[PDB]
Amino acid sequence: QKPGETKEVHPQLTTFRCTKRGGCKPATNFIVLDSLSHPIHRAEGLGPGGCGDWGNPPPKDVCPDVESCAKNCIMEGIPDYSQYGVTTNGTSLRLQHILPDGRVPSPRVYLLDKTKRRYEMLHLTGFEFTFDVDATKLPCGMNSALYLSEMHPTGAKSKYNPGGAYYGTGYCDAQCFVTPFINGLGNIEGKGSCCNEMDIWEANSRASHVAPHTCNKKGLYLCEGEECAFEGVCDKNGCGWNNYRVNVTDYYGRGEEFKVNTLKPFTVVTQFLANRRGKLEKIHRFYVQDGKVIESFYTNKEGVPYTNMIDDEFCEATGSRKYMELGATQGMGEALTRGMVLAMSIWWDQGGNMEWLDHGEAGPCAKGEGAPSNIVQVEPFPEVTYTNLRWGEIGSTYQELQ
Ligand SMILES: *[C@@H]1O[C@H](CO)[C@@H](O)[C@H](O)[C@H]1NC(C)=O
Ligand SMILES: *[C@@H]1O[C@H](CO)[C@@H](O)[C@H](O)[C@H]1NC(C)=O
C-alpha cells in the first residue's frame, strides 16, 4: 500500500556483533512493526474503510488489480510505537500483548539495519545467536517468539511497494497465511505467503520450544490451493525441540525446582553447527543463568534417539515428515546461509490455546489453562522483554562469572 503522510518513528535498539578475539561490539539497529499493523485507509476521495482483513484478498472496489490497490490504499506511519505495545530502552525491546487502555496490540516487529531501509540480514549457519529474556509475565497459552523468516531484504521494495522494509513489508512464514498485501502488493488472487522459518524461540514461563521449519522454496513464495495446506510447500509443524516432549520435566519452569528458573531473567544461546561441507547439521540450544552455563538436556524418551541437539536423525524419528521431505536440516541451513530477517512477537491462540507449546506432552499447563479467556485472570498484562541481541562466532556471545 502507498505510504501516507504520518511520520514513522522507529524505536532504536542497540545490539552486538561478537567474535572470540574482539568480544561483543555494539551496533545500531531499528525496530519496525509489520506493515499490516500500520493504519491502512483509502485514498482521499474514496470514502471510509480499509483495504482488507487478515485471511482474504483486499476489497475489489479499491483493489481490482495491483496498480489500483497501490494508489487507492494508504499505509500511515506510526509516530508512537508505544501505542502498539512496542518500546525500546538501550539494548532492551519490550513487547506488551495487552495495554492498560484494554487494547490487545499483540505486536510483531522486525529488525532493521542502521539505514532503516533494509532489514538486518542474519547469516547464521556456522554461527550463534544469543539474547537475554524476561519471561516472568508469560503464563500458559502465551507465545513470546523470536524467529527468522526468509523475507526479502528491502521488503520487496518496488514501484507499487515504495515503502518497503521501512514500513515492515514482505512478511512470510511457514504457515502460508493469506494476507491482503504480500510483498507490499495487493494480493488480488488470495495467495498465501510462504517461506522457510527458523523458530529460535517460542516460549513462555512454562515451556521453551525451538523448531526449524523448511519449505521447498527459496525466499517468499505465493501459494495457491493445496500448496498452502499441510501437504504443500512448507512444513507447518516444524521439527520441535522441547524438554517436556522428550520426557525431561525438571529443566525449565517457574521456580528453583527447574534448572532454568523462569522467575528470574536468563540468557538463551542457539548455535547453528555446520559440517565440514558447510551445511547445517545440528542446532544446539543451551542457557546461562546466575553466571553459569546450563547445558542442554539429553533426550530421555523411548523411541527418541539419545541426543542433546536437533539433527536429522532426531527430526525424522520424532515424526517431522514434512520437515524432512521439504529439505531437512541442510535445507533449513541453506535458507540461513542465504540470509534471514529477525522477527519478534507476542501472541495468543483463541482457537487452540497454544496447546502444542505447553500442554500435555509439551508442558504442565492444564486443558483450558492457556485459553485467552483464562490468561487474563492469571496475568492481565502479558509481556516479554528481549535484551542484548547478539550474534557471531561460536563460543563468543556469552561469558560465565570468574
Ligand atoms: C530502562 O532500563 C533500565 C534497567 O532495567 C531501568 O532501571 C530504567 O528504569 C529503564 N528506563 C529508561 C532507561 O527509560
Ligand atoms: C521418563 O523417563 C524415565 C527414566 O528417567 C522412564 O522411567 C519413564 O518411563 C519415562 N516416561 C515417559 C512418559 O516416557
Residue numbers in the entry: 1 to 402
In the authors' words:
Though often considered synonymous with cellulases, β-1,4-glucanases are enzymes which recognize β-1,4-linked glucan chains which are characteristic of both the cellulosic and hemicellulosic (i.e. mixed-linkage glucans, xyloglucans, and glucomannans) fractions of plant biomass. The catalytic actions of a variety of retaining β-1,4-glucanases contribute to the breakdown of lignocellulosic polysaccharides. Humicola insolens Cel7B (HiCel7B) was chosen as a model β-d-glucanase since it is well-characterized, has good hydrolytic performance with chromogenic substrates, can be readily crystallised, and has been studied in our lab previously. As a tool for the rapid detection and identification of β-1,4-glucanases, a series of glycosylated cyclophellitol inhibitors mimicking β-1,4-glucan oligosaccharides have been synthesised.
The addition of another β-1,4-linked glucose residue to the non-reducing terminus to give 5 improved the performance of the inhibitor roughly 7-fold (ESI†), however intact MS with 2.2 μM enzyme and 5 μM inhibitor revealed minimal labelling (ESI†). Treatment with 5 gave small peaks with mass differences of both ∼338 Da (equivalent to addition of 1) and ∼500 Da (expected). Soaking HiCel7B crystals with 0.1 mM 5 also gave an unliganded enzyme structure. Repeating the intact MS experiment with a higher inhibitor concentration (50 μM) resulted in more overall labelling, but still a dominant mass difference of ∼338 Da. Lowering the inhibitor (5 μM) and enzyme concentrations (0.5 μM) gave overall weaker signal, showing incomplete labelling, with a mass difference attributable to 5 as the dominant modification (ESI†). We interpret these results as indicative of an internal hydrolysis of 5 to give primarily a mixture of cellobiose and cyclophellitol, which is unreactive, and secondarily a mixture of 1 and glucose, which gives rise to the smaller observed mass difference. The observed concentration-dependence suggests that both hydrolytic processes have a higher KM than the KI of the interaction between HiCel7B and 5. Thus, the course of inhibition of HiCel7B with 5 is enzyme- and inhibitor concentration-dependent, being affected by the KM of the two possible hydrolytic pathways and the KI values for 5 and 1.
